[PDB]
From a paper:
Here, we study DHPS-3-dehydrogenase from Cupriavidus pinatubonensis (CpHpsN), a bacterium capable of utilizing DHPS as a sole carbon source. Kinetic analysis of CpHpsN reveals a strict preference for R-DHPS, catalyzing its 4-electron oxidation to R-SL, with high specificity for NAD+ over NADP+. CpHpsN forms a domain-swapped tight dimer with 28% of surface area buried at the dimer interface, with the interface featuring extensive hydrophobic and hydrogen-bond interactions. Domain 4 lies at the C-terminus and contributes to the active site and is also involved in dimerization through a metal binding site. Coordination of Zn2+ involves three residues from one monomer and one residue (His411*; * denotes the other monomer in the dimer) from the other monomer, showing that the enzyme forms an obligate dimer.
Crystals of the CpHpsN·Zn2+·NADH complex were obtained by soaking CpHpsN·Zn2+ crystals with NADH and diffracted to 2.24 Å. Attempts to soak the CpHpsN·Zn2+ crystals with high concentrations of NADH/NAD+, and SL or DHPS were unsuccessful to obtain a substrate or product bound complex. CpHpsN structures in both space groups contain a dimer in the asymmetric unit. No activity was detected for the D352A mutant of CpHpsN, most likely due to the inability to form a productive zinc-coordination complex with substrate. The 3D structure of the CpHpsN D352A mutant in complex with Zn2+ and NAD+ was solved and refined to 2.23 Å resolution and is essentially identical to the CpHpsN·Zn2+·NADH structure in the ‘open’ conformation.
Residue numbers in the entry:
A (entry chain A): 1 to 12, 15 to 361, 368 to 436
B (entry chain B): 2 to 8, 19 to 214, 225 to 358, 372 to 436
The structure:
């Protein structure tokens, strides 16, 4: 019953990014800080200090009024509070296996996280604090935050205030590849980043990919998304407002509506252009192109079919304006973050960032990105009695005589007056 | 700290391009051109039973035991990532689901000089994770099927589908879901470089020993020798505070190598020479630093105060704490190449709010959005405020004009 009442009237890289990064990294590897400063001057026209001091942080944010600060403080605490809860959800343990064998999981934060904040125009303050706040909540002891200098004065003061309030340990006025590489190689700080996070342009993305591989492109990149699942009980005016909400980001921001209600679909399709029409010019232009080219509406038969299509689309941000929200929570399986019910909405902000599904399911920005699970094992002598035998035999069946001797040596040492079937030794 | 001792992928684009277009046909085509395979790819309960009747009860009991040492750990590790609900700001509920992925592909090289553990580690781990479908591939052996040891392991580990199939054909089959109609959400298993770039496009061995003066240099030597015999590119490191032990070990390794059988003797000679390393350190604190920088896939710890090392070491694949256990007894997991239950599990986060909560959250959002010049965002807050609090007048920020 899947019917595209409105369809994607467009489709979603370059080697250009690769060239620059490779050349730029090669150079920064060679020259270090001097190359970084040079790129800063050539690219950003910047000649100031790189590492901010407590005083310059305090000075450059002194015109941010108490009311703006209080709001950012509030938004940041939300992220922190979810992040602390999420950290407690990954436990350490030990377990007895074969008698005399103990095995376990240690859980520890990485030492150093680098956070980049694009601090351009059409970017949320949230981008500055989400990485930093999450890393600190994870228990990462050192967080380096970078953002390109805004208009010659330094870091955009909101971004800078957000860095400080979120708990960044070191702040640096650097943009682009040279920021990513400095954080990665530990320039200016002497603490190489175990991971680097944060959105940016193709160059920042490519820099992360090159330096970190899979843990550098596993967080949601590209333009802002929004998906809404809605049945007959949903309110079309709200639904349409929520799509238009993320569509003002730019001309490539996808806004999807999956619904089991033709009536809703029709009303939303009608309401959206009216709402766009009443935006201020910048947003009006952004949203028109955004909805025109990338807006989709999918009428489905049953709930199950909505689950299928939503899981396929795997929206970074997914609202559920339906009855029986418990069902939808229990059945949906691929999305970035879920907004259950009408009350919450995407613009209230994420608690985590979802994976880069446009490449698939794995990664994202949460405390889990900043934590290592290490496994260990330990045995009594007694336990080896059984395990040594098995390993010797299996080893000699694999043709691994050296492996077997590791068991033989232990069997000999731990059980001197004992006979054991340790397999037939390898003669080839 | 002082160093004593020191040290195509284009057929993938085409083969995939051909499998994408032609599907199952291309896989059976590629099967005879690279392996000469005639029969169907998908085995059946009978073929699996027939082909594993040659394996004795004592061998099976060994493999079964070894799988239980993996499975039982994996089961515990699965429960270590919890689902939860939490209240933040009053009336804000938020939480985390933990879901197995749907289908995992496992690939085992049926070759010799490989561990049987290769075949069961992925399969068993995926099953303990709660994954409902595990597809398992392994390259045939001279038109005679999969090595019965690999096949028995697959089955005993709890594979749902077993497919005799190799290389890029295997990976792509599993990844597109040819023969089963079930695309794997992830594929795992060692293989050749074709296998590797096949994994890269769609989606050596090691050992280290930390030891102090209380270590038994014979055992330390033997353990280094144990994994050396894999190949000429298997590193075998020693980090120690004891020059004495450092020497006796460097002395006794060659004597153990020399006493090995033919293939293993020369395998270890190259490796221990080319890649073997030794590092003497003044303090424990120093050894931690160096171990962490190397991050061995397998790391043994033969010292006093094993707790301290458990507490302070922070980078490795698998830790073997104390003398008694040893690399050869097997991993519970694989470090980064890592393989664990966590690899096969999604977290999904969600939030829900009362109307009361949006009183404060909505007006903060409207003010921030409008500083960011995001008028439409702010209007999602406005609309909620008008619907839930009809006569309210909160500071929702100055509307954007630009
Ligand atoms: N709408 C969303 O969902 C958001 C996404 N993002 C993304 O962040 C992006 C921001 O990009 P920008 O404004 O450029 O900020 P940015 O901070 O990511 O990049 C600026 C830096 O890029 C460097 N750079 C620019 N062109 C270069 C070139 N040709 N070679 C080398 N270095 C170069 C500059 O020197 C500067 O240091 C947006 O395009 C957006 O896609 C960020 C915020 C929100
Ligand atoms: N210590 C480690 O890191 C371990 C990794 N390994 C690796 O497993 C591999 C074992 O190699 P094999 O036993 O041969 O198994 P393999 O993984 O190389 O698979 C063999 C299959 O490759 C395919 N193939 C052969 N020639 C091809 C070609 N020209 N183009 C495309 N596909 C082709 C065929 O289907 C054949 O059945 C080695 O690379 C070894 O290093 C072994 C297990 C442990
Ligand atoms: Zn937004
Ligand atoms: Zn081995």
């Amino acid at each position: 019953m899947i019917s595209y009442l409105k369809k994607a009237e467009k489709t979603p890289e370059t080697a250009t990014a690769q060239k620059v990064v490779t050349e730029m990294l090669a150079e920064i590897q060679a020259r270090g800080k001097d190359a970084v400063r040079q790129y800063a001057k050539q690219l950003d026209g910047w000649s100031g200090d790189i590492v901010l001091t407590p005083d310059q942080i305090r000075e450059q944010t002194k015109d941010v009024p108490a009311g703006v600060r209080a709001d950012i403080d509030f938004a940041i605490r939300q992220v922190t509070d979810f992040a602390l809860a999420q950290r407690e959800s990954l436990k350490e343990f030990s377990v007895e296996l074969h008698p005399g064998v103990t095995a376990g999981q240690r859980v520890l934060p990485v030492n150093v996280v680098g956070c980049y904040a694009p601090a351009g125009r059409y970017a949320h303050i949230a981008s500055a604090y989400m990485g930093v706040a999450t890393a600190k909540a994870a228990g990462v002891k050192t967080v380096v935050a970078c953002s390109s200098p805004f208009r010659g004065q330094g870091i955009h003061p909101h971004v800078l205030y957000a860095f400080q309030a979120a708990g960044a340990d070191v702040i640096m006025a650097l943009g682009g590849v040279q920021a990513i590489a400095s954080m990665a190689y530990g320039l200016f700080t002497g603490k190489p980043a175990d991971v680097v996070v944060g959105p940016g342009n193709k160059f920042v993305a490519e820099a992360k990919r090159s330096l970190y591989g899979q843990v550098g492109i596993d967080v949601f990149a590209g333009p802002s998304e929004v998906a809404v699942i809605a049945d007959e009980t949903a309110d079309p005016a709200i639904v349409a407002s929520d799509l238009v909400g993320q569509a003002e980001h730019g001309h490539e921001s996808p806004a999807w509506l999956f619904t089991t209600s033709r009536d809703l679909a029709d009303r939303v399709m009608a309401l959206v252009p009216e709402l766009i029409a009443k935006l201020p010019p910048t947003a009006r232009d952004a949203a028109t192109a955004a909805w025109r080219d990338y807006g989709e509406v999918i009428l489905c038969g049953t709930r199950e079919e909505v689950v299928e299509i939503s899981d396929r689309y795997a929206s970074e941000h997914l609202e559920v304006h339906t009855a029986d929200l418990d069902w939808w929570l229990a059945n949906l399986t691929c999305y970035g973050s879920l907004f259950l019910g009408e009350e919450t909405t995407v613009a209230f902000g994420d608690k985590t960032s979802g994976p880069n599904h446009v490449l698939r399911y794995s990664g994202g920005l949460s405390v889990h990105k900043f934590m290592k699970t290490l496994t260990w094992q330990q045995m009594t002598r007694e336990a080896t009695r059984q395990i040594g035998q098995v390993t010797a035999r299996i080893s000699r069946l694999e043709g691994m005589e050296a492996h077997a001797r590791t068991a033989d040596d232990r069997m000999a040492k731990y059980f001197p007056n004992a006979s054991f079937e340790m397999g037939t030794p390898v003669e080839v």
